[PDB]
Design an enzyme around this catalytic site. Structure first.
Site, PDB file in Angstrom:
ATOM      1  N   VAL A  40       9.281 -11.044  21.026  1.00  0.00           N
ATOM      2  CA  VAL A  40       8.065 -10.865  21.820  1.00  0.00           C
ATOM      3  C   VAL A  40       6.967 -10.271  20.945  1.00  0.00           C
ATOM      4  O   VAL A  40       7.096  -9.141  20.451  1.00  0.00           O
ATOM      5  CB  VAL A  40       8.280  -9.946  23.048  1.00  0.00           C
TER       6      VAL A  40
ATOM      7  N   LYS B  80       5.886 -14.664  24.078  1.00  0.00           N
ATOM      8  CA  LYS B  80       7.338 -14.553  24.126  1.00  0.00           C
ATOM      9  C   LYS B  80       8.004 -15.862  23.706  1.00  0.00           C
ATOM     10  O   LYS B  80       7.926 -16.858  24.426  1.00  0.00           O
ATOM     11  CB  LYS B  80       7.775 -14.142  25.525  1.00  0.00           C
TER      12      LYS B  80
ATOM     13  N   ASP C  78      17.492  -8.388  37.175  1.00  0.00           N
ATOM     14  CA  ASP C  78      17.429  -7.495  36.020  1.00  0.00           C
ATOM     15  C   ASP C  78      16.323  -6.413  36.200  1.00  0.00           C
ATOM     16  O   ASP C  78      15.470  -6.229  35.330  1.00  0.00           O
ATOM     17  CB  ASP C  78      17.206  -8.329  34.760  1.00  0.00           C
TER      18      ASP C  78
END
Ligand SMILES: COc1nc(-c2ccnc(NC(=O)C3CC3)c2)sc1C(N)=O
Ligand SMILES: COc1nc(-c2ccnc(NC(=O)C3CC3)c2)sc1C(N)=O
Lengths: 342, 347
Positions: free
Chosen positions: B36, B51, B143
């Site tokens: 990134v 990214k 996540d």
């Protein structure tokens, strides 16, 4: 401030003695409880005392396991006793000064690698404790650098923390969620409830790779990360291979990533025998992994068996060959290769 | 620094690509995904996060497909995407947010201070809006952690990023148990459940709340075993029913038999009881028993945020917290009664 408990010796007859100790300092704190360090008065010897609550329900599995364990590569249970509205069990362990975790970080943070002879010495001893505890059918289930105690004068390595350890009966299922991140076997990551003791040798191979690389070979704070990192090395596993880890995880979405040449995952200086052993440990199919005894007898460890091998500090190598009948029961013919002329 | 000039496709909108060019490109992070980078866009001067990920030969990227369908003030903006150069790589050009909850929380912990409850209220609310928004599409993030919660600390706007793990959850279709990260894994994930609901996100969010309120994680541990002993040491041992609602085939294992800890004593003594209570309602064993994200937004603990008087410590006004679309509210439209306060209807 001296404290006098009535401790039961770890091995032999259940016969308590008065044990005094002083200089209580705190060495660690974990899910289980706290780990203190004290000096025994009747010896000056330094011990690591570990307090853990005891459920009134069943006997303490760790104590039952530690009380049966006798081996020069497993931390020795000196005593155990009971302290103060509920009841804690206190395991009095032999204190060892360093750990594989602390030692590696030192080298890591100095940007230079741990010398191979130490990798041979520490890894051989690790697989010995495994070959031991496995032969009773006892899986450790938390092999990690922080659990590999290390005496830097003697090069002695001792396995510890049997909090998660368990005797595996086949057909009797066990929890998937044991083992620490970086070191979980793929079958664990896949939540397999029927892993074998080979999860310990997987983990062990992760420790070898790390000591060679200077960082974990399979990092990530998610199972997904870890699995991705495994596949970048071992390649995308197969249907036949997913099967032998955890069924119903077949036909999922996996990175079609080609296997990497093992020699190109390490520093070019790294030993072909080291890469080769590492190969045979980090294996998808849990039965295709080396048994700990088999590992001990690996060419990577041949230096250790030279008549004239000495520790970097001049001293003689520690007691590496005192195998017993049981320690060799996995494969008794290997004694011809594990026990040399001296 | 050279200027890289690429013809990238914009995220939201019709596929009408622009020449975009950028300098100062520098590494912001590395993980399983790829790299990134941060770059400066030459047009605006605006700061961007690029990214890079290897594009799978077999299928259209899942993350991109999910990101191209998302448009909310609390989800990070996909400005552009494009393909780069062996094999081929997808670049997700995201707008650069200067902070993360991870880093801000560490500052406070490092300084031995706690994040002021107002920011805890502000940030937690915004996290629940994005969760309520993406859940609305069926999308589960899978996540949620302090690192995936970007912050602009001047405007106190929080944005959810890293949809790398995100999936649209169809019932009756299995999903991998091993998503979600150390400290924030919901109990049914620790238990390796293949059939979880998007309530895993609500559990992670509950952890973050507790962590911001505690000054440290509430269920730490490098192992599932350690993590579960920490969850139990608060909630208590889960009943047979509670285990069967997280994962049957764990119903007959030998769990620590500790009696449940009162929530009031699991936090600092000045900690507001409304926060202590939002937690207890998010951190539940039974997955079906946790607050919907939208119910969370509408909870006592954020009533201050719904005050017309509320100001940020720097003097700026709060970010826009009540511009609710029907899409967002679709979970439970009558909660607008609570969610959109009187003065947000004055017009
Ligand atoms: O944590 C734990 N620590 C243990 C231990 C045993 C003997 N010596 C040491 N010494 C050190 O920690 C050296 C770093 C000073 C630790 S066992 C153990 C467990 N969880 O069972
Ligand atoms: O890791 C990741 N980081 C991302 C990102 C996006 C926009 N702004 C920032 N800014 C910062 O990190 C500031 C704190 C320095 C990060 S996305 C992302 C992923 N995994 O997709």
């Amino acid at each position: 401030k001296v404290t006098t408990v009535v401790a039961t010796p770890g091995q032999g007859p259940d016969r308590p003695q008065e044990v005094s100790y002083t200089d209580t300092k705190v060495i660690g704190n974990g899910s289980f409880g706290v780990v203190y360090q004290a000096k025994l008065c009747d010896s000056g010897e330094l011990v690591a005392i570990k307090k853990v609550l005891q459920d009134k329900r069943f006997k303490n599995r760790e104590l039952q396991i530690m009380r049966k364990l006798d081996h020069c590569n497993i931390v020795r249970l000196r005593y155990f006793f009971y302290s103060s509205d509920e009841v804690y069990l206190n395991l009095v362990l032999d204190y060892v000064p360093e750990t594989v975790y602390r030692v590696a970080r030192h080298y890591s943070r100095a940007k230079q690698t741990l010398p191979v002879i130490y990798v041979k010495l520490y890894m051989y001893q690790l697989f010995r404790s495994l070959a031991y505890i496995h032969s009773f059918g006892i899986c450790h289930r938390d092999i990690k650098p922080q659990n590999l105690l290390l005496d830097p004068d003697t090069a002695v390595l001792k396995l510890c923390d049997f909090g998660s350890a368990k005797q595996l009966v086949r057909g009797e299922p066990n929890v998937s969620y044991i083992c620490s991140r970086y070191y979980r076997a793929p079958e664990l990551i896949f939540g397999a409830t029927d892993y074998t003791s080979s999860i310990d040798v997987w983990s062990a191979g992760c420790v070898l790779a790390e000591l060679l690389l200077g960082q974990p070979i399979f990092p990530g704070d998610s199972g997904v990360d870890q699995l991705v990192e495994i596949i970048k090395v071992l390649g995308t596993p197969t249907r036949e291979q997913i099967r032998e880890m955890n069924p119903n995880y077949t036909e999922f979405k996996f990175p079609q990533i080609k296997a990497h040449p093992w020699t190109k995952v390490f520093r070019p200086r790294t030993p072909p025998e080291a890469i080769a052993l590492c190969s045979r440990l980090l294996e998808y199919t849990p039965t295709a992994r080396l048994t700990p005894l088999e590992a001990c007898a690996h060419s990577f460890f041949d230096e250790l068996r030279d008549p004239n091998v000495k520790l970097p500090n001049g001293r003689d190598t520690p007691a590496l060959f005192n195998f017993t009948t049981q320690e060799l029961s996995s494969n008794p013919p290997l004694a011809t290769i594990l026990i040399p002329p001296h």
